[PDB]
Amino acid sequence: TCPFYKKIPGTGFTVDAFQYGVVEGCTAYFLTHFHSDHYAGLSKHFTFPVYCSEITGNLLKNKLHVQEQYIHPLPLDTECIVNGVKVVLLDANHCPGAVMILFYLPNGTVILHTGDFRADPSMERSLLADQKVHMLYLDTTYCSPEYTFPSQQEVIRFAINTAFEAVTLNPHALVVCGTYSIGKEKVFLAIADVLGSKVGMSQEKYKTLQCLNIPEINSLITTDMCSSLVHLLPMMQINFKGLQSHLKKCGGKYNQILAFRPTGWTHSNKFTRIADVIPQTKGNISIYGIPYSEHSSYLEMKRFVQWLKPQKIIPTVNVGTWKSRSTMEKYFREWKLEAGY
Ligand code: NI
């Protein structure tokens, strides 16, 4: 059965609620983004209307085979009526196609559901500037002050400089980048661009990237592994065993691997600056863990919420323990007393 925080009061609508079977009273199912925890339950046998971005729509049709008649894509930054209710989709600064949804309820209440997001000051000049929000359904993944990490720009600067240095010293090194979902594509795209290479990958991953509306993508990626010195591999293969095994397959073209594992936050964030990050090394194989986040830091979250001044907050992440729920409520009360709403 569908939990409360996935229902939108005063509407026939749910958000990211496909794993509960037919939800009683649901006339339209919203999908914020194409990540498996959120789409869990969709397939070619789904026969209710799905509302989402154009990009999420491309992925539902091609990767999950949802039939076209049930896919309803909406443009961003545009007032749309759905089953007699005004809605707007906004860029969430998460993975490709990810949105936040503004719902303008028939009774005058305004609700923002962030989906998954990485809060940014640019959001303070979207259509959010224009009006009040009574309820905020908030991505609270990193809602605790220990969660610090650098900007995406600094993380990419580090990865580019690391890769370019290593391959310039050794033209016979291969670069490998881990992936398990959409998102974080800038890591592998930026590295390939500095090196003058296309990114090589499996047929399945190539298919997924071809759904994303990335400008000039055909110039950036390929299934021909042999032409490419930046390869993508599933994240589970990014270890000394997996990588040895991959170097065997390359037919003595390369004598060194440098690999990148994009993670979210890890505890080594609490001590080490991005500049000072070092790899794990065994022989001619090195592996860097880099903290490229597509979710708000604590400070980014706090800034957004203090700016929006919502009347009520409903967390959508870390909701399963009493201690988590209590901790989050404490921070919402400080933020409110500090800013005066
Ligand atoms: Ni996500």
Q: Where are the domains of the chain?
A: 1-147+296-341, 148-295
Is residue 27 within 8 Å of residue 13, measured between CB atoms? Answer: yes
Q: What is the torsional sign of CA 279, 270, 181, 275?
A: negative
Q: Say yes or no: domain 148-295 is CATH 3.40.50.300.
A: no
Compute the distance between CA of residue 233 and CA of residue 200 in angstroms, rounded to an integer.
9
* DSSP code for 255: S
Is residue 183 within 8 Å of residue 95, measured between CB atoms? Answer: yes
CA distances from 311 to 55, 85, 103, 188, 205 (A): 32, 21, 15, 41, 42
Compute the distance between CA of residue 245 and CA of residue 125 in angstroms, rounded to an integer.
49
The Å distance, Cα 326 to ligand 1 centre, comes to 24
Is residue 24 within 8 Å of residue 46, measured between CB atoms? Answer: no
Compute the distance between CA of residue 307 and CA of residue 341 in angstroms, rounded to an integer.
10
Compute the distance between CA of residue 29 and CA of residue 72 in angstroms, rounded to an integer.
10
The Å distance, Cα 225 to ligand 1 centre, comes to 29
Q: Which residues contact 274 (CB under 8 A, 6 or more apart)?
A: 150, 154, 155, 158, 291
Record the tokens describing residue 23, joined without a space.
């939800």
Closest among 178, 182, 175, 179 to 161, alpha carbons compared: 175
Data resolution in angstroms: 1.6
Q: Look-up: residue for tokens 């690999």?
A: 259
State the DSSP string of 223-234: S-GGG-SEEEEE
The Å distance, Cα 167 to ligand 1 centre, comes to 33
The Å distance, Cα 139 to ligand 1 centre, comes to 10
Closest among 330, 319, 333, 325 to 4, alpha carbons compared: 319
The alpha helices in the chain, defined as continuous H runs, are 36-39, 54-62, 152-169, 186-194, 203-210, 240-249, 298-308, 322-339
Compute the distance between CA of residue 297 and CA of residue 145 in angstroms, rounded to an integer.
8
10: left (phi over 0), alpha (psi -120 to 50) or beta: left
Is residue 134 within 8 Å of residue 144, measured between CB atoms? Answer: no
The Å distance, Cα 15 to ligand 1 centre, comes to 13
Whether the domain at 1-147+296-341 and the domain at 148-295 fall into the same CATH topology:
no
The angle, 0 to 180 degrees and rounded to 10, between the axes of the packed helices 54-62 and 203-210 is 150
CA distances from 197 to 64, 107, 156, 226 (A): 30, 55, 17, 11
Q: How many CB atoms lie within 10 A of CB 99?
A: 27
The Å distance, Cα 130 to ligand 1 centre, comes to 27
The Å distance, Cα 152 to ligand 1 centre, comes to 16
Closest among 151, 148, 175, 152 to 162, alpha carbons compared: 175
Closest among 325, 316, 324 to 135, alpha carbons compared: 316
Compute the distance between CA of residue 21 and CA of residue 305 in angstroms, rounded to an integer.
33
CA distances from 317 to 6, 23, 70, 142 (A): 12, 21, 28, 9
Record the tokens describing residue 329, joined without a space.
């409520």
Record the tokens describing residue 330, joined without a space.
């404490």
The Å distance, Cα 331 to ligand 1 centre, comes to 23
Is residue 176 within 8 Å of residue 258, measured between CB atoms? Answer: yes
CATH of 1-147+296-341, one of 3.10.129.10, 3.40.50.10490, 3.30.1360.120, 3.60.15.10: 3.60.15.10
The identity of residue 73, as a single letter, is P
Compute the distance between CA of residue 283 and CA of residue 21 in angstroms, rounded to an integer.
51
The Å distance, Cα 88 to ligand 1 centre, comes to 20
The identity of residue 97, as a single letter, is G
Order of all β-strands in the sheet with 256-263 = 221-222, 199-200, 230-234, 173-179, 256-263, 285-291, 280-282
Is residue 182 within 8 Å of residue 212, measured between CB atoms? Answer: yes
Q: Which helix (H) or strand (E) holds 31?
A: none
* DSSP code for 318: S
State the DSSP string of 139-202: --TT-STT-----HHHHHHHHHHHHHHHHHH-TTEEEEEEESSS--THHHHHHHHHTT-PEE--
CA angle, 33 then 35 then 40, to 5°: 105
* DSSP code for 235: G
Is residue 5 within 8 Å of residue 17, measured between CB atoms? Answer: no
